[PDB]
Design a protein around this motif. Structure first.
Motif, short mmCIF file in Angstrom:
data_model
loop_
_atom_site.label_atom_id
_atom_site.label_comp_id
_atom_site.label_asym_id
_atom_site.label_seq_id
_atom_site.Cartn_x
_atom_site.Cartn_y
_atom_site.Cartn_z
N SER A 232 0.99 6.63 18.52
CA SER A 232 0.40 7.59 18.98
C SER A 232 -0.87 7.00 18.60
CB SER A 232 0.57 8.89 18.72
OG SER A 232 1.51 8.80 17.12
N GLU A 233 -1.38 8.27 17.84
CA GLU A 233 -2.59 8.08 17.44
C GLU A 233 -2.84 8.66 15.60
OE1 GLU A 233 -3.71 12.99 17.43
OE2 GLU A 233 -4.77 11.55 18.99
N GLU A 234 -3.71 9.49 15.52
CA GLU A 234 -4.21 9.60 13.83
C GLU A 234 -3.57 10.68 13.07
OE1 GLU A 234 -5.68 12.03 13.23
OE2 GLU A 234 -6.96 12.46 11.93
N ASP A 235 -3.05 11.58 14.10
CA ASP A 235 -2.11 12.52 13.94
C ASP A 235 -0.43 11.96 13.00
OD1 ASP A 235 -0.41 11.85 16.10
OD2 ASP A 235 0.79 13.45 16.54
N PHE A 236 -0.91 10.61 12.86
CA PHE A 236 0.55 10.09 12.57
C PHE A 236 -0.08 10.07 11.06
CE2 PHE A 236 1.59 5.01 10.68
CZ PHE A 236 -0.74 5.49 10.85
N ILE A 237 -1.32 9.75 10.54
CA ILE A 237 -1.18 9.74 8.87
C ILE A 237 -0.91 10.99 7.94
CG2 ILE A 237 -3.91 8.27 10.26
CD1 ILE A 237 -4.15 10.33 7.26
N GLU A 238 -0.59 12.62 9.42
CA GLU A 238 0.12 13.00 8.21
C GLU A 238 1.65 12.95 8.46
OE1 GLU A 238 0.73 16.80 7.16
OE2 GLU A 238 -1.14 16.09 7.02
N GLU A 239 1.70 11.83 9.82
CA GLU A 239 3.65 11.76 9.24
C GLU A 239 3.38 10.77 8.28
OE1 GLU A 239 6.21 10.86 11.35
OE2 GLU A 239 6.35 12.34 12.91
N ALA A 240 2.67 10.08 7.93
CA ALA A 240 2.84 9.20 6.95
C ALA A 240 2.46 9.99 5.50
CB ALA A 240 1.76 8.19 6.56
N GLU A 241 2.26 10.92 5.57
CA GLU A 241 2.36 11.83 3.85
C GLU A 241 3.40 12.76 4.38
OE1 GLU A 241 -1.68 13.14 2.69
OE2 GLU A 241 -1.19 14.66 3.89
N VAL A 242 4.06 13.37 4.82
CA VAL A 242 6.03 14.00 5.24
C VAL A 242 6.60 12.82 4.22
CG1 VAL A 242 7.71 15.24 6.08
CG2 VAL A 242 5.42 16.04 6.45
N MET A 243 6.49 11.71 5.71
CA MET A 243 7.55 10.39 4.57
C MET A 243 6.78 9.79 3.32
SD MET A 243 7.81 7.17 7.48
CE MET A 243 6.92 8.39 8.58
N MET A 244 5.84 10.46 2.87
CA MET A 244 5.76 9.97 1.30
C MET A 244 6.22 10.55 0.01
SD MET A 244 2.58 7.82 0.39
CE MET A 244 3.08 7.98 -0.77
N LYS A 245 6.60 12.08 0.84
CA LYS A 245 6.37 13.22 -0.35
C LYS A 245 8.01 13.28 -0.48
CE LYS A 245 3.16 14.11 -1.39
NZ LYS A 245 3.72 12.76 -2.06
N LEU A 246 8.64 12.72 0.44
CA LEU A 246 10.54 12.16 0.70
C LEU A 246 10.45 11.27 -0.36
CD1 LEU A 246 11.22 12.44 4.21
CD2 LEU A 246 11.72 14.01 2.52
N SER A 247 10.75 11.22 -1.59
CA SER A 247 11.20 10.78 -2.38
C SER A 247 12.68 10.46 -3.26
CB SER A 247 9.70 10.50 -3.77
OG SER A 247 10.47 9.54 -4.41
N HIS A 248 13.45 9.66 -3.13
CA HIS A 248 14.37 9.75 -3.89
C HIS A 248 14.79 7.68 -4.01
CE1 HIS A 248 19.04 9.63 -3.50
NE2 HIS A 248 18.83 10.90 -4.74
N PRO A 249 15.78 8.10 -5.33
CA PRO A 249 16.38 6.65 -5.68
C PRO A 249 16.50 5.87 -4.26
CG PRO A 249 16.30 7.77 -7.47
CD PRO A 249 15.92 8.44 -5.95
N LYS A 250 17.25 6.17 -3.56
CA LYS A 250 17.81 5.49 -2.17
C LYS A 250 17.58 6.24 -0.73
CE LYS A 250 20.43 4.54 -5.59
NZ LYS A 250 22.31 4.84 -6.00
N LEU A 251 16.07 5.92 -0.87
CA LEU A 251 15.81 6.06 0.38
C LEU A 251 14.77 5.22 0.14
CD1 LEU A 251 14.87 10.08 0.93
CD2 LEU A 251 16.53 8.41 1.87
N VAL A 252 13.89 4.25 0.93
CA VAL A 252 13.74 3.24 1.50
C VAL A 252 12.26 3.74 0.94
CG1 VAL A 252 12.44 2.20 2.91
CG2 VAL A 252 14.74 1.52 1.87
N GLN A 253 11.38 3.86 0.23
CA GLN A 253 9.74 4.70 -0.07
C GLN A 253 8.88 4.09 0.15
OE1 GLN A 253 6.74 5.92 -4.52
NE2 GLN A 253 8.92 4.66 -4.45
N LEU A 254 7.61 4.69 0.94
CA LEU A 254 7.62 4.42 1.87
C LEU A 254 5.65 4.45 0.77
CD1 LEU A 254 4.21 6.13 4.61
CD2 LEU A 254 4.76 3.25 4.25
N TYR A 255 5.55 3.31 0.58
CA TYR A 255 3.87 2.79 0.13
C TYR A 255 2.22 3.63 0.58
CZ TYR A 255 6.64 0.17 -3.34
OH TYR A 255 8.06 -0.29 -4.56
N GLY A 256 1.91 3.31 1.16
CA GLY A 256 1.02 3.52 2.00
C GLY A 256 1.05 3.44 3.67
#
Ligand code: 30T
Length: 244
Positions: A40-64
């Motif tokens: 999609s567009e730039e709305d996905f840089i918000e997408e990447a922020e919900v992904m980034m709050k999802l931190s757990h040792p067994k979830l592949v982490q999103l660095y940026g």
């Protein structure tokens, strides 16, 4: 054990002093291994922020995120040995049961956390799990935005939920203990719909205990309200592993 090259170091300023010397803020230029997912567009840089709050040792982490360049990319933790399906499969014949249980547990821990956050994975299956340092398994592609892994409510009335992820996790478990074999290997999509509709389930793999087989069939109840929740699966999987 971990000797650092001075050139990676940058003293910025002194913050205090002990009795053998002084202390500094500095920077350290690391060189982290990463997996880079190009787009999609730039709305996905918000997408990447919900992904980034999802931190757990067994979830592949999103660095940026990277957007200056063309190839608009995500940056992810790099996972040593790549996808669990291929891993199970190239290493067939060398697994202990206990190991196969422990991979299932890792997934379940990551999934319990997604469940708690109310994130529905939707496509859980071993090809979407990666193996890291010491065969740790991490769930991936929960970010975004088929029948072999689908609950009846998913091919029937497209109703997704953590209970429907539980069905995929039952199939994943079957994948693990059967060391990467393809489920309903020869069946077609309608045949699967029909067989599952008539009460047929995937056979017990040799490496899976009858107990573990019970948990699989439990993940495969017909009605989701009948399936256990990741939180419960997790306590049951952890118990089996800790005892013996
Ligand atoms: O074992 S590998 O062959 C390898 C390659 C070079 C050096 C050492 C090992 C390998 C590692 C990973 N690690 C990954 C992938 C991701 C990663 C990918 C997307 C999002 C987050 C992490 N994180 N780490 N992904 C692979 N392919 C992947 C290609 C895409 C597919 O989805 C999965 C397998 C293959």
């Amino acid at each position: 054990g971990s000797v650092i090259d001075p050139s990676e170091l940058t003293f910025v300023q002194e913050i205090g002093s002990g009795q053998f010397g002084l202390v500094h803020l500095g920077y350290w230029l690391n060189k982290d291994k990463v997996a880079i997912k190009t787009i999609s567009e730039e709305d996905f840089i918000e997408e990447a922020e919900v992904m980034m709050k999802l931190s757990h040792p067994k979830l592949v982490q999103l660095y940026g995120v990277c957007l200056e360049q063309a190839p608009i990319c995500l940056v992810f933790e790099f996972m040593e040995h790549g996808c669990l399906s291929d891993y199970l499969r190239t290493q067939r014949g060398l697994f202990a049961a206990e190991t196969l249980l422990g991979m299932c547990l890792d997934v379940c821990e990551g999934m319990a956390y997604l469940e708690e956050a109310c994130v529905i994975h939707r496509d859980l299956a071993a090809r979407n799990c990666l193996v890291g340092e010491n065969q740790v398994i991490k769930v991936s592609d929960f970010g975004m935005t088929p029948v072999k892994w689908a609950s009846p409510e998913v091919f029937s009335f497209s109703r997704y939920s953590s209970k429907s992820d539980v069905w995929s996790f039952g199939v994943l478990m079957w994948e693990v203990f059967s060391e990467g074999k393809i489920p309903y290997e020869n069946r077609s999509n309608s045949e699967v719909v029909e067989d599952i509709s008539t009460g047929f389930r995937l056979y017990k793999p040799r490496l899976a205990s009858t107990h573990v087989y019970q948990i699989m069939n439990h993940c495969w109840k017909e009605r989701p309200e009948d399936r256990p929740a990741f939180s419960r699966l997790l306590r049951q999987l952890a118990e089996i592993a800790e005892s013996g």
